[PDB]
Amino acid sequence: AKNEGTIVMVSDGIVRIHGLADAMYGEMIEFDGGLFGMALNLEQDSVGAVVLGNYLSLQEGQKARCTGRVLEVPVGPELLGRVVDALGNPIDGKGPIDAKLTDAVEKVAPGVIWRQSVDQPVQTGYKSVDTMIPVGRGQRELIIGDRQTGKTAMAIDAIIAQKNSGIKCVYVAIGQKQSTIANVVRKLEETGAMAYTTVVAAAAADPAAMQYLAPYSGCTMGEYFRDRGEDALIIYDDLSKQAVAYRQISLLLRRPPGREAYPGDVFYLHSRLLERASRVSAEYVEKFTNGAVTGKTGSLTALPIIETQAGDVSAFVPTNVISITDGQIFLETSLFNAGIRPAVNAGISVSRVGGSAQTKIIKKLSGGIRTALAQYRELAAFAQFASDLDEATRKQLEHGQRVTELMKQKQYAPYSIADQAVSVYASNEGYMADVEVKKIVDFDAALIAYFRSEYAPLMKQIDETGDYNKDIEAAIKAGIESFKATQTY
Amino acid sequence: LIIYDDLSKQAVAYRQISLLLRRPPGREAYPGDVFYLHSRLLERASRVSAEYVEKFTNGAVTGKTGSLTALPIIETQAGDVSAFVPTNVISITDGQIFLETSLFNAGIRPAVNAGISVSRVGGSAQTKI
Amino acid sequence: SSGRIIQIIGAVIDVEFERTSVPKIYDALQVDGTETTLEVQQQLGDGVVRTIAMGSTEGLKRGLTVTSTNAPISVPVGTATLGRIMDVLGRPIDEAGPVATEERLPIHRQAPSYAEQAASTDLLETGIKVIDLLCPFAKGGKVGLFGGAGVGKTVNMMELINNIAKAHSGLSVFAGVGERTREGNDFYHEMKDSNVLDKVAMVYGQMNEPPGNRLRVALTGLTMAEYFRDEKDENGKGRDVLLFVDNIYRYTLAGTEVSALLGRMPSAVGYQPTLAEEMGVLQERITSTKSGSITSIQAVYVPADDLTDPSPATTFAHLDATVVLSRDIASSGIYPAIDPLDSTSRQLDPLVVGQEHYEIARAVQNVLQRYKELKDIIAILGMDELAEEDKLVVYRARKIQRFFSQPFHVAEVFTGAPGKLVPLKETIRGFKGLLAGEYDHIPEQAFYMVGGIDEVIAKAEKL
Amino acid sequence: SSGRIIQIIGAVIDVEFERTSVPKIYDALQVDGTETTLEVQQQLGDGVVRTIAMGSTEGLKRGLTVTSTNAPISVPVGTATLGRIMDVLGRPIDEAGPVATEERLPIHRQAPSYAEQAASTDLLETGIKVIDLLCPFAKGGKVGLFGGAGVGKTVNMMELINNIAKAHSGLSVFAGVGERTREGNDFYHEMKDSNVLDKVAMVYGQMNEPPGNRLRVALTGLTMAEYFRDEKDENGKGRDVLLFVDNIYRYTLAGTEVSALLGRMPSAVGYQPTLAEEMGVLQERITSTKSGSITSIQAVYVPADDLTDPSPATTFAHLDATVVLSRDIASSGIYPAIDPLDSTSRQLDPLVVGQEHYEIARAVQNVLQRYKELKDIIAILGMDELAEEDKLVVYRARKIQRFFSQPFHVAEVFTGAPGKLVPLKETIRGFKGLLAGEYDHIPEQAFYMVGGIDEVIAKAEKL
Ligand SMILES: Nc1ncnc2c1ncn2[C@@H]1O[C@H](COP(=O)(O)OP(=O)(O)OP(=O)(O)O)[C@@H](O)[C@H]1O
């Protein structure tokens, strides 16, 4: 009886079970017909549960059993280049996956003593992020904006950029349509970036329970490399859909409603997930590996995505998520429709790690350009009313315009470290002052092409090593001066 | 030809009964079934064919077409057509007659604003003259 | 083995049952002594199920007997439904006699899997050349006509109905609940006189019928469209089908009705809605598989004169293309009256359609925009003072806006014109030639209702 | 006696006891076979007490036994906690072995009486420009920072820690800072290498712990601060221990998260019914009695970035000096981002700060308030239109807005510029010169992250 049970209520994917006195919190259940549940509400005389999968073949009076184990997913290095659902079952039909290990889905993060500061960079290929809002291995950052503002373009470009680095990547799709998921998978396979990526798909045609548990399984899959000294990277397509699914589940299950028609513990829901991304120390790696590997530091990076309505950042939920992460990137509709792409708001977007997550050359170069941009924006807004100006204000305005044009980039065209370094050096030193406000977009591309055709050993040295010796800056200055004269667009 | 002196007051009475029946308030000023309350009523005014008239009358009447016309009245506050009830009835009717108050106080009586008052079947009903 | 009604509150009808036989969700039951059928929605324990009445309700009393069909509601579907009008349950109402089709399908089915999706993103080609170039559709997409009552939206629906048959031999389904405005003949007659009646199947429902009838109509239309898509010819391939789900009167109601296409009730179940599981499959059932593709056209109202972002935009979340009807251009008489600038589509991208179409389509919008911005200064101070550089822009804009007009085969029986069906590549060629300026010598009035470019030059030479 | 678990929803657990052995309020209980402990929150009669579990509730089921300790959660207090990091129940988490201390105090205790309340009389320099002028501090006081997410509260807190705590001797400081782990781990490390870990105690809890732990973190830190200040070395004092809490809001957030599950009806915005008393019983205990002194700094979160929220509005009455951070100033580039207006200190009196300081502060606030009302006029009518007496106000307001900015020692990783420190007299001299009309020819771009006036002169010369 302690494991046996009945069913007394089915509606909208919630099944409420009598009996089951010997039932823990989160332990799986077995239904008739190969269906598994999850006990989330324990009461005086009943047990709440959510069904994983289609529940239309469940009635009153059936039986259920307790497995005695927590929810777990297969995990390993053989999951690379495959597509699975929220439980790890393959769906692309490329044969079964040879699983060897299983990992718990609900687990606590590494303690405070077992962590380390983050000093290694992660490249994205975007000039804006890599120079103004740096990201590093182990840092959590957020992409925030409206609908149709290019939020997902930035996430994939980053996955593609991790080709020669050696970072395993994961992708989680929540609430998206099947056609969009198929298109994304085709794009990943075409570019060759599927050889190390894993895709978890819980589409809109899936129960809210599946759309609720996708990020946890994604993180559990991604922690395999972190616990063993290899880096990883995970992307959540949209956490707003997960919040909606959680509100649904916690309302169909009788739980008192709260502010904004949302329920309690939404902050806990979004915090117990993001905090699982950390950079462990070599002692933690050594202790977990039982001496198999030594002198290695693990890491795990996250890039959750949240969408907003009417382009406001002061909404209660967006701020609740901003307060958890170590930064945010804000995408504005007004900038998108104006031709500024990728639309990134310099003033409202920050990075908390700072220059620690950068190479030496970039950190030495990209200093104090975001604040200069915000100051320029406010100065221009004020000066649109000012009748007269002076030399200093005009110089600041021109520099701001040129920089805001230099930061525009195309899709699927990732720049490398040398390209970013050359562009930022040319901008800072002042060789873009005489060039017209238009034809700046042509300028950087032509200059990168010239610096790639010639001066190749210099770029090889800059790419392999992030050092910025006086010789490097002298060579860059000489090359930019050579390109300025005796060379046309 | 049927004329409803005021339909907003009917909505208010329905709201009173619903609220006294312990139904939830909702986020809007009125319950959500006010729309169907008005639609079920305004849908019953139409012209029938001569065949239906003969069919219903068991052949007593022939070659004559029935009809029924409605002229409901809706009350607005400070010329706000964006409210809940006013916009529910604008979208299920074949025309609107907009009577202003600025013209009424200016002496122009009847005060009809031709800019926004339109008809849909117009030009077919009018006689040749 | 037989139940009893326990609680009649609005549309919700709680029905109890014996202990060993309780109907599974979505099963249909028949009430003896009355015409009504119940649909199961959720189970409440103690052998009690919460149901919704489907037939017309009349003189219901507590404790009525009820017998179970044990199966979901099945609707007759086949080839005999073409040119017929049926109830929500498929019972005909046009006095034309019973439907001879013998096969039926359940109206509650599951989504196609990830392995059944198409291997590409194709564009559906219609006869209309404004829509095709500026707001291309996508096989399996979702369309929204953001049109007010005054403009002639219905003729656009008819032209689509006719052209799909001719263009891709694909049937259509029409479903709608009630009528919002009466400015012309009811669709049925307006389709009978145009002889497009036998290529479509129609499902209709009033508002004085129970709220069950008002719901579950899009599901019947969807099942019919699915059967049309899946049927194969001798070549082993399916058809492309259009689903014309009519708007439910107003958009305030369409807030629920738009979400009714997204599977949301307008307060039918006031205690515990069951939509997450029913809804959300509806958005999927419309898709383009490898065999066949089904697309959805839905009309909506814009009273505020605000659409898209100005509008609530809740519709804007899932719509892939928005077709906009302009009253000013309609006063002009350019039918179809579709705004060439306000209407947008997400399929207009360099990757989905190619760089050629994107380059050609993007340029014409720029010329139209410039002409719209200088029309006021042209009005106040005249055309002559304007520089010749912008005069070419104005002339080209006039040429394209006249060329947007097109004779329609559905109106041939009235006007007598031979009508036109312009293929997409020819539209691209003609627009590219006009943009480059080869047609500059060609005089005006050779594009108004002249159909295809070769017909443009024939009209030019004939006068 | 021993009880049993009868219900568990998330964090809230209610345990039913015997008839006569019902534990009093806040009588911690131990669950046998697990590392979890429970604290009583409210009584429900029938021998049932609804409690909150300290630690995760995963791994437990209904039916497990519990043993009553009949005493509140007691923590180790003494001189041996110095240099140690501990979790809320006081368990060390620094992998440094146990703590050799027998003295233990409960975390729930009453508040000091009206008789033993001491005044605050001595100023306390901090080195910041805006704080030392518009909001003077005083030893034994209470200070709070008000901000929305992302506006710089922490950086300012770390600068305050680095600027006063490291210099004052015999402080015996206490750290209750709670923030993103990454920020914490770095602190412990930074404190160590500087060899100041000797005279500091730390209590830290993360964001991932269930509501049981997040609810009672601040009480533990308060107990450790109370013990230190009260004690007196022979011929000595309590060391004037300083308390810094970076986790005040979580207290109320966990309270409102669990209030609904304890049965309390929703109030106001939806905040818990007992917000005011719950905030008061904690915010009172941070005081300076006649037997000692405590100088505290807090961080106050502003949900949705509005100060009329019931949570930050109740806290205004409980503080002496209030510092308010604005999102707009942060987005404009000015750091620190403190709103000159809406920031005030009780110690700003002509008898305390003096005569010149008061006049300087009032004149600055007057100039800024006047500039706050001239924006709309500049918009509608040209800048030229306003008289010269307002041109001066506008320009001086802009210069003053940038001159309140300085670079920090702590935040050099972001900007890469060296840190600065400014004494109070330099601030007074510079602002006196500015309001006098001197430095009216220096462009406003030379007042940015330049710190002292002579640095302003040099930076202006470099341009
Ligand atoms: N760098 C870019 N340059 C030009 N257009 C871009 C760029 N990045 C994105 N876009 C455009 O924006 C689209 C991406 O939109 P996005 O994926 O953000 O939409 P969404 O519906 O908000 O996202 P989600 O898939 O998370 O629901 C692309 O298809 C393209 O049209």
Ligand SMILES: Nc1ncnc2c1ncn2[C@@H]1O[C@H](COP(=O)(O)OP(=O)(O)O)[C@@H](O)[C@H]1O
């Ligand atoms: N003095 C400063 N100089 C430069 N940047 C700062 C300064 N103070 C704050 N910031 C920026 O503002 C952000 C505020 O971060 P933090 O204070 O840690 O979060 P919160 O404001 O929520 O406590 C930081 O990421 C930092 O980039």
Ligand SMILES: [Mg+2]
């Ligand atoms: Mg998308």
Ligand SMILES: [Mg+2]
């Ligand atoms: Mg904060």
